Amino acid sequence: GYDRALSIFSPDGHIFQVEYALEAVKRGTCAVGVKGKNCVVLGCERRSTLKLQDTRITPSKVSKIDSHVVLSFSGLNADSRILIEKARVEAQSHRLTLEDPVTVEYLTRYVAGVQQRYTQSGGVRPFGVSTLIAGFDPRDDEPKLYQTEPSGIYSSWSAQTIGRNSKTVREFLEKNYDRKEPPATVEECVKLTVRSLLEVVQTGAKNIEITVVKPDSDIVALSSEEINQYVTQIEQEKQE
Amino acid sequence: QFNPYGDNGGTILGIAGEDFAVLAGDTRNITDYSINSRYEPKVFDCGDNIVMSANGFAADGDALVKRFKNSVKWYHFDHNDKKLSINSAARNIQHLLYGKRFFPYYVHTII
Amino acid sequence: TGYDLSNSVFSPDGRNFQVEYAVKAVENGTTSIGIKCNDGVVFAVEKLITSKLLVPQKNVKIQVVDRHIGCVYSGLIPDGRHLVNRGREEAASFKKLYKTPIPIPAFADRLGQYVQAHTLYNSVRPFGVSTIFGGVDKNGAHLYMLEPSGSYWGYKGAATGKGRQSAKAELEKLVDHHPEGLSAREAVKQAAKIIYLAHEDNKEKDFELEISWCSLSETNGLHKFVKGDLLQEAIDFAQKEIN
Amino acid sequence: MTDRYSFSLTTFSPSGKLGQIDYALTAVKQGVTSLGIKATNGVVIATEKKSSSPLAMSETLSKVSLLTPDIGAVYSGMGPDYRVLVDKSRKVAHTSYKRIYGEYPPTKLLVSEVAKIMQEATQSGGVRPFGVSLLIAGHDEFNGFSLYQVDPSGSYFPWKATAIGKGSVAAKTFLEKRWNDELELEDAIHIALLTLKESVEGEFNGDTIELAIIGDENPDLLGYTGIPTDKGPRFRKLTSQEINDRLEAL
Amino acid sequence: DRGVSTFSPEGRLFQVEYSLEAIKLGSTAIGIATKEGVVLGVEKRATSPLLESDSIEKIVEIDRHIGCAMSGLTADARSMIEHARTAAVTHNLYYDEDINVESLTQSVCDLALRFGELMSRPFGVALLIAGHDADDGYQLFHAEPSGTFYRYNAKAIGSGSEGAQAELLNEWHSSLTLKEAELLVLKILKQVMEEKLDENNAQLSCITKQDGFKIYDNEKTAELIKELKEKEAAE
Amino acid sequence: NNYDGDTVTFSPTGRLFQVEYALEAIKQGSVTVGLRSNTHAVLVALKRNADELSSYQKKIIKCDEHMGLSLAGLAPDARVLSNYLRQQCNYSSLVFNRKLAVERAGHLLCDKAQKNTQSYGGRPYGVGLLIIGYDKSGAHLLEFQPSGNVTELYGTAIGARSQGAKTYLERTLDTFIKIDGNPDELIKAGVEAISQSLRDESLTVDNLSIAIVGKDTPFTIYDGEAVAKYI
Amino acid sequence: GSRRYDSRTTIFSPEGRLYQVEYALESISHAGTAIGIMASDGIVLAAERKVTSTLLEQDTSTEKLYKLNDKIAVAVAGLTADAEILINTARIHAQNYLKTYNEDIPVEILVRRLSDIKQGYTQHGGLRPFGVSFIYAGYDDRYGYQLYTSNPSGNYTGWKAISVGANTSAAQTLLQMDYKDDMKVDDAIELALKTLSKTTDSSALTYDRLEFATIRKGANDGEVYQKIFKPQEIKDILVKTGIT
Amino acid sequence: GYDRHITIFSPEGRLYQVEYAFKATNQTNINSLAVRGKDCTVVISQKKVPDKLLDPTTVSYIFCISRTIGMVVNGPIPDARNAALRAKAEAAEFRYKYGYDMPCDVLAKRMANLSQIYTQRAYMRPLGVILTFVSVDEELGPSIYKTDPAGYYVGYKATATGPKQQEITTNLENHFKKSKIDHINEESWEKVVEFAITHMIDALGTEFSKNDLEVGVATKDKFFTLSAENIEERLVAIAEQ
Amino acid sequence: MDIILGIRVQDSVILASSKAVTRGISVLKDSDDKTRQLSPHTLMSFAGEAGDTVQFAEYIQANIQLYSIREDYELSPQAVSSFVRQELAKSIRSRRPYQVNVLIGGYDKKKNKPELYQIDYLGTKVELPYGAHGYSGFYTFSLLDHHYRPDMTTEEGLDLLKLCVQELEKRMPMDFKGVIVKIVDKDGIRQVDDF
Ligand SMILES: [Cl-]
Structure with missing residues (x-):
């Protein structure tokens, strides 16, 4: 078998293949995650260079791992499918052996472990993908939002963004998001998520995707018209 | 058909005192109605102030004792010449025996 | 260019430079010889005394294969040991299947093919030793010498190492002056002399002499080391000739 | 030891070229000219027996090879590569078809299997592509007569007539003028000999030319009688004498 | 290019030396051993204020009597911790006893050099393994990706290591109490850290014979930080 | 230069640079001394520390009741090789009821190290060893x-500044060989030998490490206040 | 050793691109143009054969359009030999699904499987990727008529109308201009041929330089028919649309 | 320029490692020749023993592959012996599997296919040898089949290999142009050996002693090599006419 | 385990499964649910050798749930039954086969039809209006042959099921401790708590 060490250290103590995998994430479309008091919202960018697309059948950016957990990403699209599949398998495997669905932290730890394994295995390159994993633990009303990256490190976030122009939207969230009092309702949380994407997206038409996840496996994806109403309200308030 | 087990007879006895312990065993070794030896040692000093005997099928008995003595040696190498306590030795012997659960050492062991 | 960086690569000449570089390691090593006699063979080697702290007669260089074959080599000592280990496996499987001890020509090819195999791939390095070996079999006495390339021939006399030219010259004289042949006990004496004469190329450090022999009459066709009085007799003969 | 070349030796260059395949095609270009022509009632394949030495017996070296009783092959490029491909082609016709369906494969499917083998040498670890282009002529019940070309990439195309190797550019032009859809087998053989004479320098006769046909069934070449449904091989290699007879009426 | 297990002309493994450079870029971790216990402390170093700092796990339990702090590429440490936990529990299964801290450390270090062309590269993380056993008492070990481990009375690893180690040189003595050691870790962490030290961006832990390995709460650490400020202002 | 990328490549002068670079790692290592008489064999090792807070790296490893070694270079490689010796000594005992000969133990180490110098992918061991032991042919010392080169010696030293101790032993050859039935005097000669390799630093209680094996003396290691006698 | 000669096909550039994938896409950009157009009552697949000869046997030839099962077909752009390896794998995958669930494989599932295979060659194994781009035209009872594309990166996307191979930039602009949602198959046939006729590098578009196919519900009652056009049938539709 | 180190195509469509293996063939500086009689096939080769210390009996480039098949090699001895051992194994296996003696041309093809694999697979190098197989086949009669590092092979009426092959080749070509037959019209093999040696002397322009030559002869149901004394008798007969 | 029954009526599928778990001479439990929900509109009951039954049922459950997440779509009962059959057909030629018989009751939302499949441990699938495994069918098939009419309501199906259970309770030697009854229809799966 092909055993070649592709991910290796350099004189300055860097693993370039892992760092170049982050550059692939930087190229990817923007993804954002914001958690409220009783909800989490995942926002995603759709680049409008691709028109004449069939939006019914085109792979959606936000993927369900289980009925209570979701995964969005920035980076290579093909790579993301492999992580999602492995995660979905592990989710069912956990239910089978532990007789309880995965916690969001556990599912994140697994996905992050897979990414890490690909940074010190022979004959493989790292995943060019960073993920945002969000949801609610079984029988728990506390919102969860985690991030992973090609190196394999993971951590929890009150709010976070990844992908192209993520530096700008992270700047926005850092001043607008208050820890002492987060978005109390679903509306407030979605509004803040759409606002943060409007700093980068360009047009607020079919370029913004929103997915709301609530406790007890209550996940729903917003339509074009529903999102367009948020876009209208934000700009009308801005004209002042 | 080949029978991989045999019976070498003999009998062993362990008694625990207040600040001492004894492990006794007869020195006779047999097959069927014949005597093989009138003096064949059966109780062994295994180091770390532990004595052991594995009575029944002598070939398995010798193999087990030999492997436990070996385990004591490697316990010293791997853990900075630490003394193997009697309780730790007992647990180690369980794993030696259960390791051959589906082709057992045909012996009754006492330490 | 770049043809010499990887093993098993033909240069535009048709040469394998890696094998030629392995020869340089052989040429760097101590002198070792082999002498074919009437009913057997004699092996001898130069052991450089690097320090007084070396225990005399302990660091043995000559190795036995089976009970009838002797092996000596010059160059990287560990590579020679690896080759002898293989030779011992080859001889064992031959005797296992065919009952009779391995003939010397048969044994020579077993080593030859194994050394040659280490010139076929870039994943392995060629052997850094030239091995002189031989013994007595059903067809009589045989002496061989095997190079890093896997090339080997039969020899009347053989020599390798740093003092090979000096040795080769001395061996050529014996072949000319003794066409009817040389005896086993004579060959031991001559072997001692040739090592002493070949020591002029390694004249900085003093050395220790080591000799072995297989002979149909003197050793019943078995490999044995030359020890005690017979060794001292050969040293005295060698010391007398240089003076 | 171990084969530690588990990586591809053929890779895409910045321009999108697969270098080793292009270089393999260059090796085919240097090779001796061979051609194939399809008629209404048969197919003909031909090439020059470029003898490396006059002491060498050119009869022992067969450039035109039987793959199945109804399928033949000829090449241009590296002869040794062709020889092993013919061995593998003959075997795969049995293992992947005849041992399953109890009958020989149709021309297009055998070509597909040969093509697969050549593709794998273009992508698998530690190997170079085959340095040959094949012309495979054959017949089967449901597809009739057919002629296929197979390149180092593994790509294959069906032809009415074509040529490969040294003087293929000129030979293909010559065939375009002469070919029509109403050719009989003898007419195709005649055209094949005319086309091949242009690319040959030295001697031009039955001993220096190798030519075979896919035509009518040959019950005389079967080797046994008693089974009506077995009527014999459609592949036949023309003899030295049979070639010379047609060179007189040339 | 070049082999992964290649020696330099100086007689060092290139990849091992390069992994040590990655560890120097990592966040600071400090360990101090005393007769009353061993203290472990780390710099969390959150990349952004939105990152929930309590999810940063750079101090980790291996067993009840053994703790561990890390520095460098912390993702690499997960398989090392898993191996350590398995080794500790497995030894208890085979021998009905706690495993020696040195033996546990040795087991972790055996993985280090299992790389070639096994894993494709060395670990890019250093570990401070602290614990207690009946034979050798309270112990602190430093486990590198070279496969080497040294025992220490006190040790600092990470970006501010050489500056912290010099400070530990003067401050450490054989009669240190546990409370004195806790404050000393906080003192040195505060000195080498970029951002200002508080309960949210720094974490403490200890291992005692009685209570075993414990990660300190943010409320408990906050008091020790407040206790430190007062005693420094006292003179 | 161009021929030091891997162990499978000879240089134009017939040198193996990766092996020579591995040899260099030994010279960087701390000094250790070995010597023997007819009755006993002694190892003396100068242990090295990282700093004042750190412990002193252990230099001597026990292989069997009658055999052990001291290391200089990459310590993990010494652990791999000593583990191999432990297994080989142990195989000889279990199968043949026979204590492994020190000479044969050296032959096994030679052949194990050799395979790593001829194959692609792997690397040479980066450590030197001094093996002492007492078998059926008396006391022994190996380097x-x-x-792959293994050498039987009366005395020797390896590591940094090892030339000083090696010269001392070369002068003392006739004296210390005769120290029979006297372990303390043989150790004294070993401690005096390793002292010739010291600069600036001197032998302290937690710095020095001594080991001995003999006729009626199992392989035992002395550290701490047990070696204060010899300072 | 062998490391010296390894091209390292599965690595990132400093910019974060996969070298071999990018170069494979460059290869495909020189391949014959293939177009897929999806309508309300069917799907059209059109493709241009590359510089043919008069002596090429067209009626028995197949280089562009392949049948995966009764409901799904593909148009190829790139190395034909590479494509056939993947096609045979896809045919087997469809049959495995049919054996397991006793239902025809949904189009997307088949597409995802092939796309995952391509992905694997970019992340591990040290082999070169497949220099192939597919247009998938298929039907199932869930989503109805569907058009997909996949490329050497292993990334796939859904389309109403799409082109692959040569001159896709020019081709996509023309399709984007004249395509409408309420379009029918007969109109889509005309659009496909008109687009090829303008983007082609040849002097004139003829029957012998084309492969054509449709997937229609235009079959006796509720069922789907695949029609791979014959040379004479391509000649007739070229006259009907008014190109020749 | 790594396309010259391993067996992959150069831009010219060439395999440089194969071409350089051909050059290794002449490293020994030995010339061989093979001819066919009526009932026999004869192969001769130059024998050169430069060192006086060498045992001349062991210096040989002719091999007895099977009872019926003989093989002479042009190239270095390690590769020659590698090829010989393999050919012996293949010939033995063939007899076991298929119940009859392996023909000369079939063995040649087999060894040629093995050589072809080394030109296609990267990890295996070509052998720097040219193998000339000789026998009296039970179907085809006297046979000469020769293999090279490219994996090429063909039957021969007669052949020559070595540094001065062209001089020997043309000499043989000119003889067969006169006689107008595919063999040496001679009853006994002794006279066929005499023909072979005579035409090598004429071509190379050198005289030979008994120790300068090496001879192999193939007859029906056996192949054998001549001793020094057998060759001496052959040289005497040539000189006396 | 012992008795599992199934009946397909006009607009639903009803599965009845015994509550007893007997190991040797003792009834260890009298409230055991011998079924698993594979998907919202598909239910599988099971009976066979101890351990194998649950292990197999949960393994199938996990696989169907995995498919549902991956495709965001529910498989048809026919598709699930074919998957289950193949697993058992694969199993029968294994080292140690799954010794499990199953009934699969599902409501096809596409065709708006209830469907009942009977599959034994060999992988023998049959679609039926009513089915049973083990010795149950020897009593119940004759009753169902008489009374069953295809156009029955769910309430009529339960009455016909009560008549089956009464016969089993009268004539079978083993005390199976009653049955748990579950209905599968367009609205999903629900349990009849009083029976
Ligand atoms: Cl073959």
């Missing part, structure tokens, strides 16, 4: 190099 192992990761090139």
Whole structure:
């Protein structure tokens, strides 16, 4: 078998293949995650260079791992499918052996472990993908939002963004998001998520995707018209 | 058909005192109605102030004792010449025996 | 260019430079010889005394294969040991299947093919030793010498190492002056002399002499080391000739 | 030891070229000219027996090879590569078809299997592509007569007539003028000999030319009688004498 | 290019030396051993204020009597911790006893050099393994990706290591109490850290014979930080 | 230069640079001394520390009741090789009821180190070893190099500044060989030998490490206040 | 050793691109143009054969359009030999699904499987990727008529109308201009041929330089028919649309 | 320029490692020749023993592959012996599997296919040898089949290999142009050996002693090599006419 | 385990499964649910050798749930039954086969039809209006042959099921401790708590 060490250290103590995998994430479309008091919202960018697309059948950016957990990403699209599949398998495997669905932290730890394994295995390159994993633990009303990256490190976030122009939207969230009092309702949380994407997206038409996840496996994806109403309200308030 | 087990007879006895312990065993070794030896040692000093005997099928008995003595040696190498306590030795012997659960050492062991 | 960086690569000449570089390691090593006699063979080697702290007669260089074959080599000592280990496996499987001890020509090819195999791939390095070996079999006495390339021939006399030219010259004289042949006990004496004469190329450090022999009459066709009085007799003969 | 070349030796260059395949095609270009022509009632394949030495017996070296009783092959490029491909082609016709369906494969499917083998040498670890282009002529019940070309990439195309190797550019032009859809087998053989004479320098006769046909069934070449449904091989290699007879009426 | 297990002309493994450079870029971790216990402390170093700092796990339990702090590429440490936990529990299964801290450390270090062309590269993380056993008492070990481990009375690893180690040189003595050691870790962490030290961006832990390995709460650490400020202002 | 990328490549002068670079790692290592008489064999090792807070790296490893070694270079490689010796000594005992000969133990180490110098992918061992032991042919001392070369000696030293101790032993050859039935005097000669390799630093209680094996003396290691007698 | 000669096909550039994938896409950009157009009552697949000869046997030839099962077909752009390896794998995958669930494989599932295979060659194994781009035209009872594309990166996307191979930039602009949602198959046939006729590098578009196919519900009652056009049938539709 | 180190195509469509293996063939500086009689096939080769210390009996480039098949090699001895051992194994296996003696041309093809694999697979190098197989086949009669590092092979009426092959080749070509037959019209093999040696002397322009030559002869149901004394008798007969 | 029954009526599928778990001479439990929900509109009951039954049922459950997440779509009962059959057909030629018989009751939302499949441990699938495994069918098939009419309501199906259970309770030697009854229809799966 092909055993070649592709991910290796350099004189300055860097693993370039892992760092170049982050550059692939930087190229990817923007993804954002914001958690409220009783909800989490995942926002995603759709680049409008691709028109004449069939939006019914085109792979959606936000993927369900289980009925209570979701995964969005920035980076290579093909790579993301492999992580999602492995995660979905592990989710069912956990239910089978532990007789309880995965916690969001556990599912994140697994996905992050897979990414890490690909940074010190022979004959493989790292995943060019960073993920945002969000949801609610079984029988728990506390919102969860985690991030992973090609190196394999993971951590929890009150709010976070990844992908192209993520530096700008992270700047926005850092001043607008208050820890002492987060978005109390679903509306407030979605509004803040759409606002943060409007700093980068360009047009607020079919370029913004929103997915709301609530406790007890209550996940729903917003339509074009529903999102367009948020876009209208934000700009009308801005004209002042 | 080949029978991989045999019976070498003999009998062993362990008694625990207040600040001492004894492990006794007869020195006779047999097959069927014949005597093989009138003096064949059966109780062994295994180091770390532990004595052991594995009575029944002598070939398995010798193999087990030999492997436990070996385990004591490697316990010293791997853990900075630490003394193997009697309780730790007992647990180690369980794993030696259960390791051959589906082709057992045909012996009754006492330490 | 770049043809010499990887093993098993033909240069535009048709040469394998890696094998030629392995020869340089052989040429760097101590002198070792082999002498074919009437009913057997004699092996001898130069052991450089690097320090007084070396225990005399302990660091043995000559190795036995089976009970009838002797092996000596010059160059990287560990590579020679690896080759002898293989030779011992080859001889064992031959005797296992065919009952009779391995003939010397048969044994020579077993080593030859194994050394040659280490010139076929870039994943392995060629052997850094030239091995002189031989013994007595059903067809009589045989002496061989095997190079890093896997090339080997039969020899009347053989020599390798740093003092090979000096040795080769001395061996050529014996072949000319003794066409009817040389005896086993004579060959031991001559072997001692040739090592002493070949020591002029390694004249900085003093050395220790080591000799072995297989002979149909003197050793019943078995490999044995030359020890005690017979060794001292050969040293005295060698010391007398240089003076 | 171990084969530690588990990586591809053929890779895409910045321009999108697969270098080793292009270089393999260059090796085919240097090779001796061979051609194939399809008629209404048969197919003909031909090439020059470029003898490396006059002491060498050119009869022992067969450039035109039987793959199945109804399928033949000829090449241009590296002869040794062709020889092993013919061995593998003959075997795969049995293992992947005849041992399953109890009958020989149709021309297009055998070509597909040969093509697969050549593709794998273009992508698998530690190997170079085959340095040959094949012309495979054959017949089967449901597809009739057919002629296929197979390149180092593994790509294959069906032809009415074509040529490969040294003087293929000129030979293909010559065939375009002469070919029509109403050719009989003898007419195709005649055209094949005319086309091949242009690319040959030295001697031009039955001993220096190798030519075979896919035509009518040959019950005389079967080797046994008693089974009506077995009527014999459609592949036949023309003899030295049979070639010379047609060179007189040339 | 070049082999992964290649020696330099100086007689060092290139990849091992390069992994040590990655560890120097990592966040600071400090360990101090005393007769009353061993203290472990780390710099969390959150990349952004939105990152929930309590999810940063750079101090980790291996067993009840053994703790561990890390520095460098912390993702690499997960398989090392898993191996350590398995080794500790497995030894208890085979021998009905706690495993020696040195033996546990040795087991972790055996993985280090299992790389070639096994894993494709060395670990890019250093570990401070602290614990207690009946034979050798309270112990602190430093486990590198070279496969080497040294025992220490006190040790600092990470970006501010050489500056912290010099400070530990003067401050450490054989009669240190546990409370004195806790404050000393906080003192040195505060000195080498970029951002200002508080309960949210720094974490403490200890291992005692009685209570075993414990990660300190943010409320408990906050008091020790407040206790430190007062005693420094006292003179 | 161009021929030091891997162990499978000879240089134009017939040198193996990766093996020579592995040999260099030994010279960087701390000094250790070996010597013997007819009755006993002694190892003396100068342990090295990282700093004042750190412990002193252990230099001596026990292989069997009658055999052990001291290391200089990459310590993990010494652990791998000593583990191999432990297994080989142990195989000889279990199968043949026979204590492994010190000479044969050296032959096994030679052949193990050799395979790593001829194959692609792997690397040479980066450590030198001094093996002492008492077998059926009396006391023995071996010197192992990761090139594969093993040498039986009366006395020797390896590591940094080892030339000083090696010269001393070369002068004292006739004296210390005669120290029979006297372990303390043989150790004294070993401690005096390693002292010739010291600069600036001197032998302290937690710095020095001594080991001995003999006729009626199992392989035992002395550290701490047990070696204060010899300072 | 062998490391010296390894091209390292599965690595990132400093910019974060996969070298071999990018170069494979460059290869495909020189391949014959293939177009897929999806309508309300069917799907059209059109493709241009590359510089043919008069002596090429067209009626028995197949280089562009392949049948995966009764409901799904593909148009190829790139190395034909590479494509056939993947096609045979896809045919087997469809049959495995049919054996397991006793239902025809949904189009997307088949597409995802092939796309995952391509992905694997970019992340591990040290082999070169497949220099192939597919247009998938298929039907199932869930989503109805569907058009997909996949490329050497292993990334796939859904389309109403799409082109692959040569001159896709020019081709996509023309399709984007004249395509409408309420379009029918007969109109889509005309659009496909008109687009090829303008983007082609040849002097004139003829029957012998084309492969054509449709997937229609235009079959006796509720069922789907695949029609791979014959040379004479391509000649007739070229006259009907008014190109020749 | 790594396309010259391993067996992959150069831009010219060439395999440089194969071409350089051909050059290794002449490293020994030995010339061989093979001819066919009526009932026999004869192969001769130059024998050169430069060192006086060498045992001349062991210096040989002719091999007895099977009872019926003989093989002479042009190239270095390690590769020659590698090829010989393999050919012996293949010939033995063939007899076991298929119940009859392996023909000369079939063995040649087999060894040629093995050589072809080394030109296609990267990890295996070509052998720097040219193998000339000789026998009296039970179907085809006297046979000469020769293999090279490219994996090429063909039957021969007669052949020559070595540094001065062209001089020997043309000499043989000119003889067969006169006689107008595919063999040496001679009853006994002794006279066929005499023909072979005579025409090598004429071509190379050198005289030979008994120790300068090496001879192999193939007859029906056996192949054998001549001793020094057998060759001496052959040289005497040539000189006396 | 012992008795599992199934009946397909006009607009639903009803599965009845015994509550007893007997190991040797003792009834260890009298409230055991011998079924698993594979998907919202598909239910599988099971009976066979101890351990194998649950292990197999949960393994199938996990696989169907995995498919549902991956495709965001529910498989048809026919598709699930074919998957289950193949697993058992694969199993029968294994080292140690799954010794499990199953009934699969599902409501096809596409065709708006209830469907009942009977599959034994060999992988023998049959679609039926009513089915049973083990010795149950020897009593119940004759009753169902008489009374069953295809156009029955769910309430009529339960009455016909009560008549089956009464016969089993009268004539079978083993005390199976009653049955748990579950209905599968367009609205999903629900349990009849009083029976
Ligand atoms: Cl073959």
